[PDB]
Design a protein around this ligand. Structure first.
Ligand SMILES: Nc1ncnc2c1ncn2[C@@H]1O[C@H](COP(=O)(O)OP(=O)(O)NP(=O)(O)O)[C@@H](O)[C@H]1O
Ligand SMILES: Nc1ncnc2c1ncn2[C@@H]1O[C@H](COP(=O)(O)OP(=O)(O)NP(=O)(O)O)[C@@H](O)[C@H]1O
Ligand SMILES: [Cl-]
Ligand SMILES: [Cl-]
Ligand SMILES: [K+]
Ligand SMILES: [K+]
Ligand SMILES: [K+]
Ligand SMILES: [K+]
Ligand SMILES: [Mg+2]
Ligand SMILES: [Mg+2]
Ligand SMILES: [Mg+2]
Ligand SMILES: [Mg+2]
Ligand SMILES: [Mg+2]
Ligand SMILES: [Mg+2]
Lengths: 296, 296
């Protein structure tokens, strides 16, 4: 177990880490005039990923889903803790898994600074992520105002389709979600509210609506879906997009004025306006310019 | 699961929390001139606690073992995240478990500011603890010097005895360890090195010896054991004390000069000098003034 840490999880720490792996706790010197942003998310084998998922993909997604919650605040990710409960000690598995962890960390300039390694009957992983943001400038789930656009990044429904069609190209969106870190940072001071879409667009937008004490009207034909989902029947397409989940895209609200400023930035991801915030505290849908009753 | 969070894990925190439970991440405004101290430890049902352990004790210990690693740095604890994987939703269990979480947090002035709640086949808990310490003043596992006293707080072996004698009063030490938070803070500026005894005195002192590139000679009859263990045959007594684990006491090294200073403080726990640091890089034992060969 102590050898497991040294063998797989003790790459040299960044110069930006006061004390990394090796002691009872890690130490971080805060950057000035910034708040600590902190979150944790658990992945349970067979629940948050198929049992047969490659160890590298498990490692990647364990980090990615937590970076997504830092990004959903408009913050910049800094470091993570890794808590893993393992049924067995398998070198090939541990090599792939740790490679997955570090590949995702390195993509986004994040340090692995600590954690815990235990034995347990079922593979269970909890990553804690830490980031920093200019004091007072976090993008909350509250903050959405009547007249704001509702927007979402990338595509929604991919991962859900992937889960139900394993082996299909869209499985890559299930196994390797992309946390939208740079977009989150670019939305600081532009977005009036934000959440990452981890459970499903309707449910997660719903948290914003409830927190902001507003409602929204979405346009079904504007939901950004993969060409593959564009070719399946409407009803199923919209279910994948609205209740699929595991997208790890950012859903946010923004004034038309700030939206124009957003579109003028160089962004590493697609942005789509899918509706607007309204006064009535309900989530409703529009299609071809008419009300569209829809149960999700 | 959203009902669970609201019903059991959403009490108002200390004023020192910029944003607590309810958003994608929590926000903390760092106190000036302090470093973030951060750790995580997992408890797996049946492994880190007997399956029949009361939910209140499970909640208490989940927090306590993590406050212990904050204390082991000399730092002051501030807040925790709670990640729980639950096989079933049981109201009586959740009431007891959450009461245990909050009882430990409240005793030590700690806020529960976030976490994750999931379904899984086996009860698994990971708490992340966050604390703060004056920049540069952490007590590391490195730093022990030849001639330094080796010391330990409280009693060692209680929890291990309790585990093997479930039903005995010493089970209290297994179920309800006390993190030595105030002692940890009082050892800032005095201890030359420190670790908390979670795995066993010999093993955990061993991490200090390895990090400091020194050895130690312990005096077996000076080990602080319960009167109950004083009545056991000495070999088994010393095995509980040196290899029992789950003590969550602090083991630290300290100059004779600084030990005198320590004893002048008003402390909330027993402190015992049990040996001293030596040049040769080995852990050895002495009994009644003679070398005492002992395998842990
Ligand atoms: N999977 C992991 N990834 C990264 N760091 C880890 C991991 N597991 C453990 N660590 C780090 O390795 C060091 C030793 O960990 P550990 O033995 O769990 O310390 P501890 O909490 O003080 N003891 P214990 O309470 O018995 O678990 C610490 O600095 C941990 O933060
Ligand atoms: N057991 C818990 N104790 C304390 N806070 C919790 C707990 N579970 C969840 N929370 C908090 O409750 C809020 C909602 O949690 P959660 O639904 O897990 O958010 P999320 O990470 O954005 N979504 P997801 O990735 O699907 O898990 C967050 O502010 C969490 O930090
Ligand atoms: Cl273990
Ligand atoms: Cl779940
Ligand atoms: K730790
Ligand atoms: K947010
Ligand atoms: K979260
Ligand atoms: K330490
Ligand atoms: Mg420790
Ligand atoms: Mg999340
Ligand atoms: Mg640990
Ligand atoms: Mg989220
Ligand atoms: Mg520990
Ligand atoms: Mg979560």
């Amino acid at each position: 177990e102590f050898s497991i840490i040294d063998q797989y999880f003790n790459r040299q720490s960044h110069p930006d880490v006061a004390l990394g792996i090796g002691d009872d706790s890690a130490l971080i010197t805060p950057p000035p005039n910034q708040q600590l942003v902190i979150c944790a998310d658990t992945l349970v084998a067979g629940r948050h990923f198929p049992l047969e998922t490659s160890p590298h993909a498990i490692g990647w997604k364990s980090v990615a889903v937590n970076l997504s919650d830092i990004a959903a605040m408009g913050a910049k990710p800094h470091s993570i803790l890794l808590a893993i409960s393992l049924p067995q000690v398998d070198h090939e598995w541990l090599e792939g898994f740790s490679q997955g962890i570090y590949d995702c960390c390195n993509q986004f300039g994040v340090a692995l600074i600590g954690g815990d390694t235990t034995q347990g009957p079922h593979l269970t992983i909890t990553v804690t992520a830490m980031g920093w943001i200019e004091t007072g400038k976090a993008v909350l789930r509250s903050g959405a105002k009547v007249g704001d656009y509702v927007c979402v990044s990338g595509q929604i429904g991919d991962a859900a389709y992937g889960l139900q069609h394993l082996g299909h190209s869209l499985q890559q969106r299930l196994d390797y979600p992309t946390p939208r870190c740079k977009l989150g940072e670019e939305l600081k001071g532009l977005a009036s509210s934000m959440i990452d879409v981890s459970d499903g667009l309707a449910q997660d937008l719903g948290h914003i609506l409830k927190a902001s004490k507003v409602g929204a009207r979405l346009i079904l034909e504007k939901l950004p879906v993969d060409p593959v989902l564009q070719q399946i029947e409407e009803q199923q397409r919209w279910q994948y997009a609205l209740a699929g989940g595991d997208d790890y895209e950012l859903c946010f609200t923004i004034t038309p004025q700030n939206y124009e400023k957003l579109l003028q930035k160089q962004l590493d991801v697609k942005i789509t306006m899918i509706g607007q915030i309204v006064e009535q505290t309900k989530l409703t849908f529009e299609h071809l310019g008419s009300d569209y009753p829809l149960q999700i």
